[PDB]
Amino acid sequence: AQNPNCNIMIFHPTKEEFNDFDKYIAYMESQGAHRAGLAKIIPPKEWKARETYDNISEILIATPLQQVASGRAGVFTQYHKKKKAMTVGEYRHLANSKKYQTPPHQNFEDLERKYWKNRIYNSPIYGADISGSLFDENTKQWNLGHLGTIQDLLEKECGVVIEGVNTPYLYFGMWKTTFAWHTEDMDLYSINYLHLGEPKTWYVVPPEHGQRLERLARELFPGSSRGCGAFLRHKVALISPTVLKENGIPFNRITQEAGEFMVTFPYGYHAGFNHGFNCAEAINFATPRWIDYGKMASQCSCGEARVTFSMDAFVRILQPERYDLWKRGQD
Template structure:
């Protein structure tokens, strides 16, 4: 079993080291801080965020807009948090509310953070706290030019300077007003960006982090515990509704680190570092996102939630154009030849590794090739499978499995011939993935996938050949999921791929069905 605890680094920069924000972050990355996913920065004594102090007048004037009541449901270390919007409230009233008997931490152990942490996990589903999250504003002095959360001077500022794009809480600051048990669920930042969090005043904040190198494993585990959510949205962790206890992470051999943040301390999260936590009492933190050049590859591969309209989406075009000009032409064509930075196995061997992220890939084209399509196409079953794993867009595979069923299993799904190889390859991809994972909870899907492959049939005598999926009774929910996914898939227009798939379809017909055909 992997050790449950990894050490989160703490840095104490001098004032000179502190002056250049981007350079300092790069320097701690040179010391491998990013491999943990989280770091604490204790600023030098010369640095002051708010020279006038946090006087009562300033607190009285601030309004906490639409705080959320956090209803938590679940048991045995697996929980879902539901945020119920509340009326806006003055910060002074919020402070009094957090100190009331209903919302305050137990007085008997209020000074013992270790006992409070245990109490948090024991009482997570009772006495729903109020959290003043995502409140636009800043408590940092405007004339503070060093480590000012509202102006960090990183490449994320290109969004404003070059395109005039402002995204609340991403390249502008948010304030967070916490109370006892107010929580933030497991998530990575929008677009897998960096984040900075400064605790202005109040009670400490507890952080948990999973190293980016174990992000894939955590996603797989979370998907197994929230299977229905994962089926509806592969990027469901973007919803920030999932709480999983550290004890379960230890049981699943997923390493994690934890760190307590106090007043006048910064926390930095790194790209693709899953983190979560809670507050020990009334406090105020200020946060935003930022980016260094190292982030660009993470941004290019970041998962996107497709089931909500309010999710942050940032076009990577301008970043690729400015910082990766040699890749820009391919990027515009939809070709991304680089692996996800955390897919270490993929970078070591010349073989594709299945990724949870919907990588923005498209078919490779070779305009200078004089060979015929068939001469350059794979000729064996293994080569065909490998070819599709390497070159077909991941989002096309995902669309087969991600929607809820709306159609009966006897519904005939009409599709073009040139999509048949893609459908078949997608099913083989699912089977390959299930074989690789070797998880008990994947057995049903593995059996179903095998059944689908054997029952896939079509007529090659017409340019518009219907596909029939009948008799799939092993698992209704997966069967219907596949059927509905196929139904939605055939509605998509993939003209750019038709020319490429026709010769591949010929090979598949000859290999899998022993059929000679002319298309």
């Protein structure tokens, strides 16, 4: 069995290996990458996502989200308070202001310490989930706006044609902006490209150990657990590395820098934070190996998780018994 300790693997494809996305994902899996839940892909030196980032300031962040925490430093939830619209240029200035900027630090490990110690005492503003793409249309390799769609994968594997579309999302981050512990909708893969700016630190639980994380989360968030049998679908709970180590939960960590891709694998729980002003682009995708994970994926039916139009068909076809209850939660 490849990668039996479930370590995060880092890949350096050549330009020739960067041509066929599906084939490279399947290669990574042949080497055991999925066992970690997360892999890093460093693009060949010849590749670029686009020529420059000099003209992105007029992108609108229609609903910036202020991430307000409740709890203790290592075990907290966050809610998102909607703020007034602002442009990327306005948001970049805000991120760099004395109130929000990254503090002085020695290295990524010192910053990580400062994040865990101090996150809860601040409410950073995240420009998340913005439909769009920063890949140049002429970038033919690993262009997240040109991937094969999940609807087409389900059709190729299962023969059923379904409605829905699959497009990318931009994330504009600042120091302390946080992504809570989650797997993807329907336990899909995700791919995330860090276009510019400061790094993003990731934490991940191997898929084979995801239920250990879920059991801890039910213990640590006991009211939330009573409210919903899949409350980590709400994407609000944070648990620190220190707490995970104290409770024997297997995980790994890695820092993504600008110009690098990360891939999350089906049922790989992940969480993390941004080091300073940055912009990432991400999208979900599927492969044949996902289908069995989609069929088994938990679902939130309490009403909180509320998701895209396109998840309807996935539930309806892969999880027909759950469909009725899940759709009640959507409506």
